[PDB]
Amino acid sequence: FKTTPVDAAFVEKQKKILSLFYNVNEISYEAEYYKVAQDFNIEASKDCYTNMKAYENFMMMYKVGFLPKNLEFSIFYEKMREEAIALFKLFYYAKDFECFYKTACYARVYMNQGMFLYAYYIAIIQRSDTASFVLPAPYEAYPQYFVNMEVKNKMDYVKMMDGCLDEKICYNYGIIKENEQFVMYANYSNSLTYPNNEDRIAYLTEDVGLNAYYYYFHSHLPFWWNSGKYGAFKERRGEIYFFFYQQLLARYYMERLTNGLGKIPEFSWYSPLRTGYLPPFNSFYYPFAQRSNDYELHTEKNYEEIRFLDIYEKTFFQYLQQGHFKAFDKKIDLHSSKAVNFVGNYWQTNADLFEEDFLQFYQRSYEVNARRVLGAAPKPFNQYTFIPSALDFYQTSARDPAFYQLYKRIVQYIIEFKQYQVPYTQEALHFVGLKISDVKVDKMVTFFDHFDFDAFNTVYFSKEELKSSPHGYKVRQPRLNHKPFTVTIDIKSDVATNAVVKMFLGPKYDENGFPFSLEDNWMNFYELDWFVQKVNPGQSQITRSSTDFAFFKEDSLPMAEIYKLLDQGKIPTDMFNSSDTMPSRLMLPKGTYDGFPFQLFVFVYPYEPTPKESEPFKAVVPDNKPFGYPFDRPVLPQYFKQPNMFFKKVLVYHEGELFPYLFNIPHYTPDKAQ
Amino acid sequence: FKTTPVDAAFVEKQKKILSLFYNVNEISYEAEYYKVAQDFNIEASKDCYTNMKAYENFMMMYKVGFLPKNLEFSIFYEKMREEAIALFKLFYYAKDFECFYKTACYARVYMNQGMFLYAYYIAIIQRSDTASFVLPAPYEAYPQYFVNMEVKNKMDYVKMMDGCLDEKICYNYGIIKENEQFVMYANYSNSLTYPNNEDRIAYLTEDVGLNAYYYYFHSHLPFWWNSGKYGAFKERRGEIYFFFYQQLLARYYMERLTNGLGKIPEFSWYSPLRTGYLPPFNSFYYPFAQRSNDYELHTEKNYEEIRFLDIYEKTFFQYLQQGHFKAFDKKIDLHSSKAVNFVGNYWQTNADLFEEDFLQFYQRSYEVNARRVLGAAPKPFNQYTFIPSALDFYQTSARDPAFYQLYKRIVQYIIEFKQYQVPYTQEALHFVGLKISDVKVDKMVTFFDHFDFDAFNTVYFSKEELKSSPHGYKVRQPRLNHKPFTVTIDIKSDVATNAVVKMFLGPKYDENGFPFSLEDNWMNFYELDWFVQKVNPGQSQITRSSTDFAFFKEDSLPMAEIYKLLDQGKIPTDMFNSSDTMPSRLMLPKGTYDGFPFQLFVFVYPYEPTPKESEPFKAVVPDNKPFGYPFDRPVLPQYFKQPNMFFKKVLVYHEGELFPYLFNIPHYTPDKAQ
Ligand SMILES: *[C@@H]1O[C@H](CO)[C@@H](O[C@@H]2O[C@H](CO)[C@@H](O[C@@H]3O[C@H](CO[C@H]4O[C@H](CO)[C@@H](O)[C@H](O)[C@@H]4O)[C@@H](O)[C@H](O[C@H]4O[C@H](CO)[C@@H](O)[C@H](O)[C@@H]4O)[C@@H]3O)[C@H](O)[C@H]2NC(C)=O)[C@H](O)[C@H]1NC(C)=O
Ligand SMILES: *[C@@H]1O[C@H](CO)[C@@H](O[C@@H]2O[C@H](CO)[C@@H](O[C@@H]3O[C@H](CO[C@H]4O[C@H](CO)[C@@H](O)[C@H](O)[C@@H]4O)[C@@H](O)[C@H](O[C@H]4O[C@H](CO)[C@@H](O)[C@H](O)[C@@H]4O)[C@@H]3O)[C@H](O)[C@H]2NC(C)=O)[C@H](O)[C@H]1NC(C)=O
Ligand SMILES: *[C@@H]1O[C@H](CO)[C@@H](O[C@@H]2O[C@H](CO)[C@@H](O[C@@H]3O[C@H](CO[C@H]4O[C@H](CO)[C@@H](O)[C@H](O)[C@@H]4O)[C@@H](O)[C@H](O[C@H]4O[C@H](CO)[C@@H](O)[C@H](O)[C@@H]4O)[C@@H]3O)[C@H](O)[C@H]2NC(C)=O)[C@H](O)[C@H]1NC(C)=O
Ligand SMILES: *[C@@H]1O[C@H](CO)[C@@H](O[C@@H]2O[C@H](CO)[C@@H](O[C@@H]3O[C@H](CO[C@H]4O[C@H](CO)[C@@H](O)[C@H](O)[C@@H]4O)[C@@H](O)[C@H](O[C@H]4O[C@H](CO)[C@@H](O)[C@H](O)[C@@H]4O)[C@@H]3O)[C@H](O)[C@H]2NC(C)=O)[C@H](O)[C@H]1NC(C)=O
Ligand code: NA
Ligand code: NA
């Protein structure tokens, strides 16, 4: 519930930014943004931009025309990408906030909804003056991607009937009036959307924050954008790539573990993919593409793409087999520091992997092609109209099990390369004159909580209604969550030093009930937190609350609540400092009444600062150390018995109901955690 | 039956070497090796070794621990390889025989049986002072890999009953007392181990000497060992590789021919392998992995390895398509001399293919991966416990038909490259003023013979029994064999010269009854012999006895007989000079009563000496000429009608029984050859 103060100039500018997220699916002919848009003469505005070549480029594509309103926009299709990147460059190179805003009002009014939102979200995140301003949560901007079609439909019907037929009847269908607004209860999906064991974890993969999280990841550093803005970070880009996915997959594999699901399965482009998924969405023209269980990847429609994909991976194998090779106009050694970066950019086909300021249409991307084949859609009708899968959007990608299958496949390939890195030696890890004597944690408890957000942006309003910037329509759904807990660390030091304290969470046992060995477990640990303590000689005890963990955040406030906070000169400080991290809700994987066993790994090493990175991301240790150190590479497990290391077995309990559905039953009062 | 004299210092040193092969599966707490081992302080012995880095390396791995006793050891698994190579380096760098021996007694006592044997066999072969000493035959050191499980079991039972229930009853089960020792008759395998036509040739592929032969090949020059020891041989290593397999496959294809079996079949990693095999073995934990007929190679478990294997071969295709290319930090032309070497090292993934003194864990090997996929086992439990196939050991590899399928696939690939070599011209092959006028051979007759060896090393003895170094337990099995024959060569020379005389054996007809043409037959010929004659002008006749053929040897003597020979200051001179060649038994493929037709090819060319190679192997012609010249590459068959060449059609007859089983029937006296 934490805030940050803000003056009137901010408030007024902020409000201007947010005003464009109102009733995104329509136009209020009475809005201020509409007057600005009408007043804006795009052909006479060359002087609004600091880059005339970008403006000229836009005006050219614009003279021929863009993606029409009402078609689905996706970053994964070439022409739409060029157009969206072009729009973004105008947003970005606008000289001023006033020029930025006029341009944004223009695009808001005259361009495809999805395109505009896409570029506007990114621009705000990216523009120097505009960063430090808050954005509505991805699910409040794009409800259509965060709301399964049962509810979305009920919403259509409720709006068409301007309320309920008879209030008791739609109490039974989970629809409520609460404070002049509607609330629809929403369950997670059937086996008619997840038609296999994967359904056990719908509550994770359909989770709105998880999905938001991935969308924020993309938006902070789009594959198509070079690193110029982040200077010295350019060097660490590929390294992020690995860390982001490795880390995400670890979090995901933990959920599997507590639902008895075991290892994410391998697959092949020459065989059928066992595990299907039926996205519960529809676009303007099309229901989303369904991928049934045992879907044949290898058919006529996909042959040429499979040829592409196969060689793409096999050339990585050739790079591993040589060790030094000239590739992409560089001479690159895989014992080199620069290697980690290369690898990452190679798999993502970055703008950085090439010359490029902005990615050339013609540089074929393994991720792009992978998502087309796994999405299982029919081939696009023309280049403005394609049949959407979940893999077509960062908002929806984490929903399809095939997503984790793809990125696990990538991560394994990079781990294959990671054999070329030099495993940390003993004195390397050994912190001289520093020992952790004990670690102690509070009770770790997961549980479920209803959570609300306003889905009004996917609901339609009348000419009259739009004047009021109407937003009646809320989705209440049980989401994972845990109680706050503290870790206390007992330390003995010879000397006063400065130390970094990192603590990770990972698995304890196989699916066979065997202890994981570190040589096989290191990729399965995810970072919870890091910080810097001045450490005194003698015995000390460091306490750390789950509330202060570096890698997690509070939920976003609805746009309504943001405005209510501006009215009293404030902003939600997590939405401010760190919108791009995992929600704290999802910090722990769902536990059991037993207590599910995991290891908390605590690690203390010497703090040796470097000049602050200017960061596209999660502020990471002001260190020359890698991301996710010391788990950034294969280990020699002997070297992990150091006195400044501590593995502590920890059990995650659960409380109240065991399944989200038990919360959305009309007339049943659930067991709520206390 | 030929020997070599030896003094008392040799005898005493020899005996010390052999003492460690007694009751390998246990420890005699009363043995001398046990006292030496107890007395040996490994941590205080840094001064026993000429390479302190190797000692430090060992002591490090040793401080963390090795493969425990009773697990199966295999060179094909990473950690076990590192440990075994480390042990070997200690054996190798021991400064002295006394240091070598103390170290060997230590490992004998405290380390895994298989590991120790592996490294000790190799060390002895490799150490300067210790070469020129004799080693027990691989099948007497590792009976477990040379004895099918019917017999192995009967042996267990016989030891448990301390003899036979009733002597007549186990005469019926083929068990005999002969001179206070046991003899078990052993048949070759059913179709419940070879479940297809491949069974026709079990008598070849289960043959103990053939298998020994391959094990000796490995042990003389391990893939993981650089060539430093053999100096200028380093240059010819890849060339051996081809010659060894090409040659072996020729010998194998001849057996096929006389059993009406035809060409070794091709296969694909994307398809099922037709031809299964059920290894008749079990380890401590596991029965060996079975590969049924029509086993699907392409499944989830094997996908990622298939990706590896496929690109591994396809990059060889790219090297063929370019002709000059930078690869492995060399610039390599396939018209170059160095090419043949490269090719070989590429397919075997040698230590030489890289920088390496000793092979790095992380350099993935096509042979290693091939054997895992074709072995069809479940994936290893942890890295000290895997489920063995026949392809896991050089002792057992030649038993699995898939072995010949793999290496034929390799050999074909190199033959594909061999198009880049320049075919021998006419004057190149033409020996001026030298003509073979006639060739004449004695009758070539194969037949079967019982053969004995002591399998005691896979049988367990009591605390008391071990004191006597007990060895009761023998396996008598019919093995292929031929009668000695002589070739006489009629020569006419203008001049006195020195000539090399080479003679090869190969096929006459297709499976279709058509004469093979040389363009297609050259890879199917195997070298029988080469030598150097001073040739006088005028007419001469050279005789050569099958007994003196350069490429074949007498059987090994049992360890008992070795000791009985030392007692009178001698050693078996074949076990001395040439333990690493094919047994003479297997010189000819099994004939028929008809006479089976083959060609003997006789070739005489000018002897032009070069400084003697210091040889890891079969002393080959002291020539600048290739291995297996003039059949080292594709031919132009015109150029093979020279006067110093002679192709002679030759028929191999058989005598006595036609099948080995007819020899192991109780109360049936077989037709024995005379
Ligand atoms: C039933 O299905 C049919 C076929 O799919 C649809 O017919 C298409 O209708 C769309 C309009 O919705 C057409 O696309 C638009 O029409 C014009 C095309 O002009 C043609 O002729 C000019 C020369 O005058 C050429 O330059 C051009 O190549 C075309 O061949 C354009 O005027 C339109 O441009 C407008 O919209 C764009 C964005 O789309 C803006 O950028 C512009 O400013 C402008 O406002 C647009 O291109 C399309 O041509 C039709 N297809 C075919 C094959 O004829 C029906 O719409 C559909 N019916 C229903 C009820 O869905
Ligand atoms: C999220 O998903 C969950 C899980 O599927 C849904 O929960 C189901 O919800 C429905 C309500 O929508 C439940 O159905 C109701 O069952 C009640 C309990 O009945 C018991 O006793 C009756 C006799 O009263 C027996 O017949 C029955 O076998 C049980 O023993 C009933 O009292 C309800 O009565 C209704 O019946 C008829 C329809 O046949 C109506 O016309 C009546 O007017 C009356 O409303 C009703 O049938 C069901 O139990 C729940 N399932 C589970 C597994 O718990 C949530 O609804 C869903 N939430 C959202 C928002 O989708
Ligand atoms: C039933 O199946 C179970 C599970 O597979 C088997 O249990 C395993 O038993 C083996 C022993 O046979 C265990 O391995 C050994 O145990 C010790 C492991 O110590 C643990 O704790 C220390 C800290 O004290 C850690 O360092 C370490 O990571 C371990 O977690 C070691 O002391 C042993 O070392 C000894 O042998 C090695 C070679 O193995 C020598 O090099 C050493 O000098 C020393 O003598 C060894 O590592 C194994 O831990 C057990 N597995 C599990 C999962 O617990 C049962 O044996 C089996 N029962 C039967 C009848 O087969
Ligand atoms: C290597 O593999 C070969 C080939 O399989 C084995 O050879 C077989 O060996 C068994 C002996 O172990 C043979 O079985 C014996 O057959 C004899 C010949 O019998 C003929 O006459 C009898 C009447 O006397 C007829 O019934 C029969 O049809 C034949 O016409 C019998 O005299 C033997 O008598 C035994 O029978 C019973 C079991 O039913 C016992 O209880 C008796 O006490 C008595 O011993 C016996 O049945 C068989 O012929 C061989 N097969 C072949 C193809 O030749 C080798 O044994 C094997 N060697 C090893 C070491 O494994
Ligand atoms: Na499509
Ligand atoms: Na999955």
Ligand code: NA
């Ligand atoms: Na295995």
Ligand code: NA
């Ligand atoms: Na075969």
